[PDB]
Design a protein around this ligand. Structure first.
Ligand SMILES: Cc1cc2nc3c(=O)[nH]c(=O)nc-3n(C[C@H](O)[C@H](O)[C@H](O)COP(=O)(O)OP(=O)(O)OC[C@H]3O[C@@H](n4cnc5c(N)ncnc54)[C@H](O)[C@@H]3O)c2cc1C
Ligand SMILES: [Mg+2]
Length: 537
């Protein structure tokens, strides 16, 4: 009529702390309509390389947005979801209703630059205002880079140094007022023509189905802004008592792999939860009070032990900004070049399918296919197992596998973690037994084998004495507990002692040739390695 503004969701799937959205609503007073839009373009929101679980999480999130738009506006406002190429969709939408601006939350990773530039140039041509707002990260990543002399901080501690110089991150914006916004009704033939969904589709609509095995699902996950805010409330409630008490109870501090769909990692990845609101509610809770206690070596004062997790996120995000080669070794200036073994299909598949014969490794890989989430310590162990503390396969194969199956799976965060863990050759402790022995670790994290039997069901009738190391069973025990090694449960696809010695050697031989390391992404020190691996030291 008088025209419309598009708020275009890719990430930033939420109504709170949404600068791009307030900007789309900035013209309510002039009768400018609002069009909420999501486009399945075969890449957006992590949809080029995606499994069932994350696709389910994304759909949940879109439904929740639509539901909220509907709730606020007595049903007048809907999320329009298309399938196709955005420039093509947007040019023709313009034809139907004059777009005055198209607002997005900045997608900062280089993999989005092409997509976003096609719309930039489209907006220039059609004289549409192209409004881009930084909101997925705590700081504008360029700010951090220009502050560090034009290169991203390559260590956590150097990143902290930089954002200390910059100052605390922006607070979240106000909440959008939707009750008085106008929405548009489009010609039905346009809607059919541009493949606008009538109802949200299911993963199968995109030819995405059940995983490399399917139904080990013990816990499940609701995507969406609503669930995010519920989880944050629970988190804050728990912190509140800890704060009042002045400390964590010994078991709140323990890695619990038998626990939650209580993580907000996927919510943060899709932006159902604003990272600034998370930051600032933790800050406000701990504001102005000195504590003494600590959590896993990290002080509690100021909530540093939690805000610090958000910094790790920001730190990998920031490193990737100007590096379209961030997800590979060859050509990546911030990744040590390491002489990995050449791709070995059998070893790789065995790893993906959880068929390595190392119970904890298999349980974790299988949990990843089933539910799409692993505790930080299981991610650690299967990553070292794949790379420097086992198979000596390159970390790229791991990254690629995680990016498909993780409910979170940020491109930058996941690659960052893969490089950090696997390629930091100067970090001697990183090759220690406390990190490369999945058996010792499995005894710490899962003493009774309950987790293991949960996801490696063939070891179910195996008793506690043997569950972590079933190959220690004699022939008679193997037959009695219905589990022959080489039939029911595979043999260890490698000799770990030998593998580890060979690999530690390549690291030594690696350091001594370079002598002085080029700047690469790495642990700031040995203490940080302790924290990162949740080491009992
Ligand atoms: C090989 C590997 C791959 C990983 N891939 C991802 C990924 O694709 N997406 C992802 O969000 N995390 C990734 N991580 C990091 C981390 O394991 C998860 O963020 C963590 O398990 C989430 O559980 P939580 O929310 O309870 O973490 P919490 O301790 O509760 O922290 C909360 C949030 O802080 C952020 N955070 C915590 N740890 C890290 C970290 N090491 N790096 C970056 N951000 C962090 C996350 O957003 C996390 O949700 C990876 C780690 C490894 C070792
Ligand atoms: Mg969380």
């Amino acid at each position: 009529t008088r025209g419309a503004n598009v708020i275009w969701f890719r990430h930033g799937l939420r109504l709170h702390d949404n600068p791009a959205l307030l900007a789309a609503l900035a013209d309510k007073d002039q009768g400018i309509a609002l069009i909420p839009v999501f486009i399945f373009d075969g890449e957006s929101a992590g949809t080029k390389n995606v499994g069932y679980n994350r696709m389910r999480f994304l759909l949940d999130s879109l439904q929740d947005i639509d539901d909220q738009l509907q709730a606020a506006t007595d049903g007048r406002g809907r999320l329009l979801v298309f399938e196709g190429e955005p420039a093509y969709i947007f040019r023709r939408l313009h034809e139907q209703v004059r777009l005055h601006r198209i607002c997005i939350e900045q997608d900062c990773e280089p993999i989005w630059n092409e997509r976003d530039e096609s719309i930039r140039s489209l907006c220039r041509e059609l004289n549409i205002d192209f409004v881009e707002k930084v909101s997925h990260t705590l700081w504008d990543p360029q700010l951090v880079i220009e502050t560090n002399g034009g290169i991203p901080p390559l260590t956590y501690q150097m990143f902290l140094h930089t954002v200390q110089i910059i100052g605390l991150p922006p607070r979240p914006t106000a909440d959008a007022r939707l009750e008085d916004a106008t929405f548009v009704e489009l010609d039905p033939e346009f809607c059919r023509s541009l493949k606008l969904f009538e109802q949200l589709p299911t993963p199968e609509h995109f030819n995405v189905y059940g995983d490399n095995m399917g139904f080990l699902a013990k816990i499940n996950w609701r995507g969406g802004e609503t669930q995010a805010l519920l989880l944050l409330d629970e988190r804050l409630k728990v912190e509140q008592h800890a704060f009042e008490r002045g400390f964590y109870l010994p078991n709140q501090a323990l890695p619990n792999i038998h626990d939650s769909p209580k993580s907000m990692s996927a919510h943060l990845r899709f932006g159902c939860l604003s990272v600034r609101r998370f930051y600032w509610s933790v800050h406000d809770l701990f504001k102005n009070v000195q504590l003494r206690a600590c959590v896993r070596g990290v002080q509690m004062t100021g909530g540093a032990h939690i805000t610090g997790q958000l910094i790790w996120r920001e730190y990998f995000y920031t490193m990737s900004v100007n590096n379209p080669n961030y997800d590979r070794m060859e050509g990546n200036d911030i990744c040590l070049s390491i002489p990995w073994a050449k791709p070995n299909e059998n070893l790789l598949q065995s790893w993906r399918l959880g068929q390595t014969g190392f119970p904890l490794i298999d349980g974790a890989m299988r949990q990843l296919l089933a539910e799409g989430w692993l505790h930080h310590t299981l991610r650690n162990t299967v990553a070292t197992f794949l790379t420097r503390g086992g198979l000596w396969q390159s970390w790229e194969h791991g990254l690629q596998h995680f990016l498909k199956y993780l409910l979170d799976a940020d491109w930058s965060v996941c690659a960052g973690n893969w490089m950090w863990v696997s390629s930091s050759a100067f970090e001697r402790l990183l090759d220690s037994s406390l990190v490369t022995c999945p058996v010792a670790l499995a005894k710490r994290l899962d003493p009774d084998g309950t987790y293991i039997k949960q996801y490696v069901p063939e070891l179910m009738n195996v008793p506690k004495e043997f569950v972590h190391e079933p190959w220690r069973m004699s022939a008679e025990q193997q037959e009695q507990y219905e589990c022959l090694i080489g039939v029911h449960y595979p043999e260890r696809i490698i000799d770990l002692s030998m593998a580890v010695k060979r690999n530690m050697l390549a690291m030594k031989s690696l350091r001594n040739s370079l002598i002085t390391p080029p700047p690469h992404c790495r642990p700031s020190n040995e203490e940080e390695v302790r924290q990162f691996f949740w080491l009992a030291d």
